Write an enzyme that holds these catalytic residues in place. Sequence first.
Site, PDB file in Angstrom:
ATOM      1  N   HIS A 226     -10.726 -53.285  36.163  1.00 20.92           N
ATOM      2  CA  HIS A 226     -12.240 -52.636  35.699  1.00 20.92           C
ATOM      3  C   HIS A 226     -11.988 -52.065  34.151  1.00 20.92           C
ATOM      4  CE1 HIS A 226     -15.150 -50.060  36.557  1.00 20.92           C
ATOM      5  NE2 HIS A 226     -15.341 -50.328  37.537  1.00 20.92           N
ATOM      6  N   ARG A 269     -15.653 -56.525  35.807  1.00 24.77           N
ATOM      7  CA  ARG A 269     -14.801 -57.112  36.721  1.00 24.77           C
ATOM      8  C   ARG A 269     -15.204 -58.217  36.694  1.00 24.77           C
ATOM      9  NH1 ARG A 269     -14.762 -54.483  42.720  1.00 24.77           N
ATOM     10  NH2 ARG A 269     -16.666 -53.123  42.437  1.00 24.77           N
ATOM     11  N   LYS A 272     -18.034 -61.009  38.527  1.00 25.95           N
ATOM     12  CA  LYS A 272     -18.907 -59.611  39.481  1.00 25.95           C
ATOM     13  C   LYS A 272     -19.884 -59.933  38.437  1.00 25.95           C
ATOM     14  CE  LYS A 272     -19.598 -56.927  41.700  1.00 25.95           C
ATOM     15  NZ  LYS A 272     -19.218 -55.104  42.201  1.00 25.95           N
ATOM     16  N   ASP A 275     -23.718 -56.031  32.418  1.00 24.92           N
ATOM     17  CA  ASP A 275     -24.057 -55.058  33.423  1.00 24.92           C
ATOM     18  C   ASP A 275     -24.554 -54.432  31.906  1.00 24.92           C
ATOM     19  OD1 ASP A 275     -24.960 -52.082  33.063  1.00 24.92           O
ATOM     20  OD2 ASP A 275     -23.805 -51.474  34.874  1.00 24.92           O
ATOM     21  N   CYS A 277     -24.002 -51.550  30.111  1.00 28.70           N
ATOM     22  CA  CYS A 277     -23.294 -50.402  30.748  1.00 28.70           C
ATOM     23  C   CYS A 277     -21.840 -50.268  30.168  1.00 28.70           C
ATOM     24  CB  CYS A 277     -23.232 -49.248  31.270  1.00 28.70           C
ATOM     25  SG  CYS A 277     -22.509 -49.895  32.855  1.00 28.70           S
ATOM     26  N   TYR A 278     -21.638 -51.358  30.226  1.00 28.71           N
ATOM     27  CA  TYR A 278     -20.519 -52.471  29.807  1.00 28.71           C
ATOM     28  C   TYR A 278     -20.131 -53.276  28.304  1.00 28.71           C
ATOM     29  CZ  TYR A 278     -18.529 -52.077  34.657  1.00 28.71           C
ATOM     30  OH  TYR A 278     -18.271 -51.023  35.640  1.00 28.71           O
ATOM     31  N   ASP A 330     -29.133 -51.510  32.634  1.00 25.47           N
ATOM     32  CA  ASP A 330     -28.164 -52.762  33.337  1.00 25.47           C
ATOM     33  C   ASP A 330     -28.472 -53.438  32.999  1.00 25.47           C
ATOM     34  OD1 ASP A 330     -26.853 -53.716  35.044  1.00 25.47           O
ATOM     35  OD2 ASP A 330     -26.999 -53.019  36.586  1.00 25.47           O
ATOM     36  N   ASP A 337     -32.592 -45.086  32.965  1.00 25.55           N
ATOM     37  CA  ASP A 337     -31.120 -43.832  33.424  1.00 25.55           C
ATOM     38  C   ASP A 337     -30.596 -43.614  31.234  1.00 25.55           C
ATOM     39  OD1 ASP A 337     -28.680 -44.852  32.967  1.00 25.55           O
ATOM     40  OD2 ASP A 337     -30.048 -46.339  34.643  1.00 25.55           O
ATOM     41  N   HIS A 340     -27.792 -45.299  30.894  1.00 28.38           N
ATOM     42  CA  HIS A 340     -27.037 -46.731  30.571  1.00 28.38           C
ATOM     43  C   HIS A 340     -27.428 -46.212  29.070  1.00 28.38           C
ATOM     44  CE1 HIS A 340     -26.744 -48.206  35.336  1.00 28.38           C
ATOM     45  NE2 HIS A 340     -26.196 -48.561  33.741  1.00 28.38           N
TER      46      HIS A 340
HETATM   47  C1  LIG Z   1     -20.229 -40.826  33.581  1.00 29.63           C
HETATM   48  C2  LIG Z   1     -20.392 -41.201  35.308  1.00 29.63           C
HETATM   49  C3  LIG Z   1     -19.362 -42.494  35.607  1.00 29.63           C
HETATM   50  C4  LIG Z   1     -19.652 -43.098  35.287  1.00 29.63           C
HETATM   51  C5  LIG Z   1     -19.247 -42.385  36.956  1.00 29.63           C
HETATM   52  N1  LIG Z   1     -20.317 -42.280  37.839  1.00 29.63           N
HETATM   53  C6  LIG Z   1     -19.909 -43.153  38.639  1.00 29.63           C
HETATM   54  O1  LIG Z   1     -19.853 -44.492  38.688  1.00 29.63           O
HETATM   55  C7  LIG Z   1     -21.618 -42.760  39.320  1.00 29.63           C
HETATM   56  N2  LIG Z   1     -22.292 -44.632  39.071  1.00 29.63           N
HETATM   57  C8  LIG Z   1     -23.035 -44.625  37.869  1.00 29.63           C
HETATM   58  O2  LIG Z   1     -23.255 -44.428  37.281  1.00 29.63           O
HETATM   59  C9  LIG Z   1     -23.639 -46.634  38.082  1.00 29.63           C
HETATM   60  C10 LIG Z   1     -23.656 -47.250  37.107  1.00 29.63           C
HETATM   61  S1  LIG Z   1     -23.460 -49.149  36.644  1.00 29.63           S
HETATM   62  C11 LIG Z   1     -21.725 -49.069  37.254  1.00 29.63           C
HETATM   63  C12 LIG Z   1     -20.631 -48.848  36.106  1.00 29.63           C
HETATM   64  C13 LIG Z   1     -20.100 -47.355  36.007  1.00 29.63           C
HETATM   65  C14 LIG Z   1     -19.427 -46.809  37.005  1.00 29.63           C
HETATM   66  C15 LIG Z   1     -19.293 -47.490  35.338  1.00 29.63           C
HETATM   67  C16 LIG Z   1     -18.046 -47.171  35.219  1.00 29.63           C
HETATM   68  C17 LIG Z   1     -16.939 -46.782  34.182  1.00 29.63           C
HETATM   69  C18 LIG Z   1     -15.945 -45.041  35.043  1.00 29.63           C
HETATM   70  C19 LIG Z   1     -15.625 -45.279  36.377  1.00 29.63           C
HETATM   71  C20 LIG Z   1     -15.494 -45.147  33.105  1.00 29.63           C
HETATM   72  C21 LIG Z   1     -16.382 -43.756  33.485  1.00 29.63           C
HETATM   73  C22 LIG Z   1     -15.515 -42.884  31.937  1.00 29.63           C
HETATM   74  C23 LIG Z   1     -15.612 -41.125  32.165  1.00 29.63           C
HETATM   75  C24 LIG Z   1     -14.423 -40.440  31.014  1.00 29.63           C
HETATM   76  C25 LIG Z   1     -15.773 -40.326  33.089  1.00 29.63           C
HETATM   77  N3  LIG Z   1     -24.732 -46.071  38.516  1.00 29.63           N
HETATM   78  C26 LIG Z   1     -25.569 -47.157  39.589  1.00 29.63           C
HETATM   79  C27 LIG Z   1     -27.027 -47.066  39.891  1.00 29.63           C
HETATM   80  O3  LIG Z   1     -24.623 -48.613  40.422  1.00 29.63           O
HETATM   81  C28 LIG Z   1     -22.027 -42.974  40.902  1.00 29.63           C
HETATM   82  C29 LIG Z   1     -23.323 -42.460  41.148  1.00 29.63           C
HETATM   83  C30 LIG Z   1     -21.244 -43.914  41.311  1.00 29.63           C
HETATM   84  C31 LIG Z   1     -17.767 -40.679  37.579  1.00 29.63           C
HETATM   85  O4  LIG Z   1     -16.634 -40.673  36.558  1.00 29.63           O
HETATM   86  N4  LIG Z   1     -18.548 -40.448  38.190  1.00 29.63           N
HETATM   87  C32 LIG Z   1     -18.179 -39.024  39.340  1.00 29.63           C
HETATM   88  C33 LIG Z   1     -18.017 -37.857  38.211  1.00 29.63           C
HETATM   89  C34 LIG Z   1     -19.465 -36.863  38.095  1.00 29.63           C
HETATM   90  S2  LIG Z   1     -19.906 -35.584  36.827  1.00 29.63           S
HETATM   91  C35 LIG Z   1     -19.362 -34.257  38.197  1.00 29.63           C
HETATM   92  C36 LIG Z   1     -18.308 -39.039  40.495  1.00 29.63           C
HETATM   93  O5  LIG Z   1     -18.738 -37.897  41.092  1.00 29.63           O
HETATM   94  O6  LIG Z   1     -20.170 -39.344  41.143  1.00 29.63           O
HETATM   95 ZN   LIG Z   2     -24.358 -49.870  34.348  1.00 29.84          ZN
END
Ligand SMILES: CC[C@H](C)[C@H](NC(=O)[C@@H](NC(=O)[C@H](CSC/C=C(\C)CC/C=C(\C)CCC=C(C)C)NC(C)=O)C(C)C)C(=O)N[C@@H](CCSC)C(=O)O
Ligand SMILES: [Zn+2]
Lengths: 401, 315
Positions: A226, A269, A272, A275, A277-278, A330, A337, A340
């Site tokens: 990922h 991935r 998929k 996006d 943010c990637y 995205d 947001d 992004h």
């Molecule tokens: C910065 C927050 C981090 C990405 C993560 N949040 C989420 O997964 C939230 N979803 C989204 O932001 C998505 C974005 S589009 C899909 C791509 C990603 C999520 C990128 C993944 C990157 C990661 C895992 C690395 C993060 C790096 C760090 C240093 C933390 N939005 C949509 C509409 O799909 C949630 C809503 C799932 C995260 O870490 N979330 C945690 C931490 C919150 S702080 C207390 C959570 O608990 O949600």
């Molecule tokens: Zn994204």
Amino acid sequence: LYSLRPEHARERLQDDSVETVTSIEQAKVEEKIQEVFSSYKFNHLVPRLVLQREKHFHYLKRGLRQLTDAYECLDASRPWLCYWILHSLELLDEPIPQIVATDVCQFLELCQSPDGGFGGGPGQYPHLAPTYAAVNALCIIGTEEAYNVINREKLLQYLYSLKQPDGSFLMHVGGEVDVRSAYCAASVASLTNIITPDLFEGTAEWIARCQNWEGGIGGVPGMEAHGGYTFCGLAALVILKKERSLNLKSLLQWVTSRQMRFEGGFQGRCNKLVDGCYSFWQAGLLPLLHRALHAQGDPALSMSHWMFHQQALQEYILMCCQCPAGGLLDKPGKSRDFYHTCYCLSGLSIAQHFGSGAMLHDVVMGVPENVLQPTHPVYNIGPDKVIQATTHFLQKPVPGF
Amino acid sequence: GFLSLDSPTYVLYRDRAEWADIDPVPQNDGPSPVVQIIYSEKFRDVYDYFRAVLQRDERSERAFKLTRDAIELNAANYTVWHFRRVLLRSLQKDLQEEMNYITAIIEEQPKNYQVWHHRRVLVEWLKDPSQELEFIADILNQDAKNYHAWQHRQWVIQEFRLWDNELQYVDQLLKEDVRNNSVWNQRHFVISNTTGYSDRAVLEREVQYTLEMIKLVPHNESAWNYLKGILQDRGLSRYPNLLNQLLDLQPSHSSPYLIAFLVDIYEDMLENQCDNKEDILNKALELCEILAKEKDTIRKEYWRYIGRSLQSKHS
Ligand SMILES: CC[C@H](C)[C@H](NC(=O)[C@@H](NC(=O)[C@H](CSC/C=C(\C)CC/C=C(\C)CCC=C(C)C)NC(C)=O)C(C)C)C(=O)N[C@@H](CCSC)C(=O)O
Ligand SMILES: [Zn+2]
Ligand SMILES: [Mg+2]
């Protein structure tokens, strides 16, 4: 424009006449992207790749003070909203009035736990994600006031409280484990100079176990490769000086394969969707892999470009990820947001600025006013902020307990 | 007495008589707030009250029911989730009813981290994984690529050793979408944790299966990445027949994956003292230029790096 070339239409998906959910969703995306690419043609204007700086700025400067109830889902990610916004303003070269900065400092003080680390809001239990965000935010501000907000002795205690026997870290007490924690910890511990000799013992080895058959890295061992987790894994290793614990070559082949031939952006991935943010999590790995392979004295490395199509990525971001009203997103059809906006801008900066030792080479697509402030690929805050913070905290000794 | 947060007759906590004794505690954002959320009345009401019971550490049934509301308002609030687990043990709540609860909310918010971690904690507490594979299969039926669902599935399988029917579940999902990379990953997870890929018959079965998949959908990258991933181990040059067999798909099933795969087999031959080094090197360098200039230009910088790197090494 690479995306607008005629031969570019040949990069469209070839489903081999075997449709599945995957090919159908991809096709829908390429369809929408193509419409955006051709919008110029059908309207008879000359394409102007312009980064809507002022639009992005009003959006950001306003979000920095207040947000609608649409943000209730981020009530436990307030230090993140500060980081995302302050970093977006930083890439746009927009300044932080000493008054705003002091207000941000005071707010993060309220998010800080008496046990070290930061919670997602005033009075919330500490968690490594908002701790990373809070510290990065305070470093972007970079004042003595900001630096002093962080209680370094309690921060080290906190990190020690999440450390696991296998090398991993919990995200918070009673919480989950995944590669993000190793990075959140290595980022805040290094910037603040609280790394003890045993703090990250076994951590490089644990992260190395997250690299799978694909070349990429999963959240925990056994998981699918990922983009977000891979950045955390590699960036954490760079901080620890253990990048060699990974098979850098298979990782290099995996990340470069994540750039979409048609859309030009990066997918998180294999198989998929693209996006925006990637643009950071995935493209940000190229500068890191450059630095590592170079540290191994790799002779075949470029002296002007990263190992991905910088042009195509800048085009996807500029043409497909901006919301006219300000803010980034995205993909077309998605809502803007702050998350992004931060990573689309972060990935653009990486796409524009190349550097390797004495070599420096930019690639700024569209109008030259598009060029953004550079971003440190490990911390994702301005390189100056990194040097400035580390040099400051290096005046303090590592907490001895 | 669960008054649904969405009930037409839902009443603010401040208007509830069974809560009139407690004073709600407002949030301290400071005199000059930043990233201040303009909460809705309902949100603000529940959280000001959650703050009240948490600050006083009130482990009551009423506090327990309220965390449910605070979770539904923001399921990502991990502080609330913590207090909820605190009350689940204090009040000695039926953990099976709580499994019913977590099942419902995960169906609603499958990409939330907290909801999955909570379900895991419950399964540990109960030492009961009996509903797991079935529950996860239902989530995967809605989004076959949900990362948390796959992660939870791996944890239950490894933790409780439920390996026996997973390869079969994998084959089922691969039939539905041979392009689902999460499933290609699960295939590898099961195999490496059971038979391993050293078993020649297994390896042979896997390479053959994969090749049949490449024949059906030549442009499916997952099957290509899987073929590489399982052979790359011992070294692609260790398999002499493979170059030939793919060189045969050169006209029929010739995607840029096949080309890239050939450059991969060559890279390993050159490193493993192969016959015709000058010859092999040229082919691999030729393919890198075709890829860089024509077939896979999005990756031109990578393929050039490869060409350069191959020269510097095997000149
Ligand atoms: C910065 C927050 C981090 C990405 C993560 N949040 C989420 O997964 C939230 N979803 C989204 O932001 C998505 C974005 S589009 C899909 C791509 C990603 C999520 C990128 C993944 C990157 C990661 C895992 C690395 C993060 C790096 C760090 C240093 C933390 N939005 C949509 C509409 O799909 C949630 C809503 C799932 C995260 O870490 N979330 C945690 C931490 C919150 S702080 C207390 C959570 O608990 O949600
Ligand atoms: Zn994204
Ligand atoms: Mg948690």
